[PDB]
Ligand SMILES: CC[C@@H](C)n1ncn(-c2ccc(N3CCN(c4ccc(OC[C@H]5CO[C@](Cn6cncn6)(c6ccc(Cl)cc6Cl)O5)cc4)CC3)cc2)c1=O
């Protein structure tokens with residue numbers, strides 16, 4: 001029959017109160033009370049939490065007409081645009097749009113991306129000076145505003161960042177998104193909407209400029225190392241032959257930059273903080289860096305590919321502090337799952353955060369210990385033991401890029417600076433859509449040369 005329910009405090013509002021304090025602890029606590037599968041009413045939504053790695057196969061392998069992403073992420077529509085990604089007309093169109101982004105994240109482009117990271121950090125160290133303190137979360141976000149923009153949109157975007165305040169507009173859009181929007185998509189957000197329109201106009205100009213550049217240098221279209229997401233969007237069609245609209249192109253770019261920015265800056269923050277706060281971990285990270293760099297003075301893709309330990313540090317941060325704490329679908333048909341049938345209309349929930357603390361999987365899960373991965377391989381105990389990037393048909397297409405951007409940034413910063421964190425590593429703050437550390441996050445830095 002139906003899964004057990006978390007008793008409602010009120011009707012309607014149901015369990016929103018305990019949930020919103022800490023959605024992660026909410027799931028953990030109620031797992032203990034009611035088991036692997038339970039349902040809670042939250043601001044009117046029937047939400048069925050799947051809480052053990054063992055049972056996640058049917059979630060991640062279901063087709064979109066059984067478990068819909070579009071029904072649950074559609075709320076993003078005012079940020080991304082009408083008709084884009086989870087507001088696409090069909091599952092099929094969404095997948096095609098996702099592929100246009102993934103198509104600018106090729107190995108050829110990755111080699112160029114490393115140079116971009118070097119370039120932006122070099123600009124940034126001018127601001128920072130020989131020593132000081134800086135907010136880690138801001139520093140990463142500020143770096144990734146410039147790096148992700150150039151990576152995805154091309155270098156032509158940088159003059160907008162430097163001269164037309166594009167970075168501020170991103171913030172206006174992105175602080176205009178409340179996690180509550182998940183429940184009340186219609187929440188007015190007029191500042192967000194003004195900024196989104198401004199970025200829209202700028203990205204329209206970027207497209208128009210690229211068009212005529214594709215006139216004066218069609219060779220660009222033949223060079224895989226110079227082809228970015230703007231170029232792919234300007235030269236592709238859907239499979240059935242239908243052309244893209246510039247409105248669609250703008251929305252896809254914005255969606256891509258969104259995805260491309262937060263989850264990464266938050267991960268780089270938690271990673272750097274944990275690395276510089278643990279002497280043994282920092283020693284190993286630096287030993288690895290010194291061996292890989294050899295006599296070489298800057299980064300390249302091949303070097304980054306060898307940074308196995310640093311990559312484990314990032315994965316360990318993702319186990320502990322995955323920035324998307326909930327993965328969701330709406331059931332369009334009833335769904336079995338253990339003894340239970342989950343009713344049509346329920347929202348199924350999987351939590352990367354819960355998974356990362358599960359004890360069937362990880363020993364002392366509150367400790368940041370990259371060696372649980374490299375040596376004890378604890379993640380491999382279950383097929384879905386670690387799902388920071390999701391899994392199955394909708395698994396994150398930006399992974400390897402994430403890994404690249406975060407590893408590069410951390411590696412370059414280490415090369416530049418000795419760094420120590422000020423205070424305890426914070427707790428996560430559940431106030432935002434993408435979850436990051438509670439401010440403030442400060443660190444002391446000093447130049448190494
Ligand atoms: C705020 C105070 C108090 C009232 N409160 N306290 C806590 N909460 C709360 C928190 C969180 C949540 N939620 C609901 C929203 N949520 C969430 C919803 C959708 C979602 O979508 C994942 C999809 C959609 O966007 C992306 C994100 N992404 C992928 N890679 C990097 N980011 C995505 C995929 C593709 C593209 Cl192109 C763009 C985007 Cl953004 O994947 C992620 C999280 C987290 C839990 C609800 C309430 C509160 O309301």
Ligand code: HEM
Pocket residue numbers: 069095098101256257259260261263264267322323324327328387388389390391393394395396397398399401402
């Ligand atoms: C550490 C950084 C990142 C984390 C933790 C992360 C996490 C995720 C997760 C969990 C999903 C699955 C969502 C779901 O199935 O409901 C996902 C999907 C996706 N991610 Fe990421 N992501 C990261 C970086 C990126 C980057 C950098 C991009 C683009 C540049 C990106 C683009 C996407 C896209 C397009 C999807 C949708 C796949 C689909 O629906 O088919 N992500 N991501």
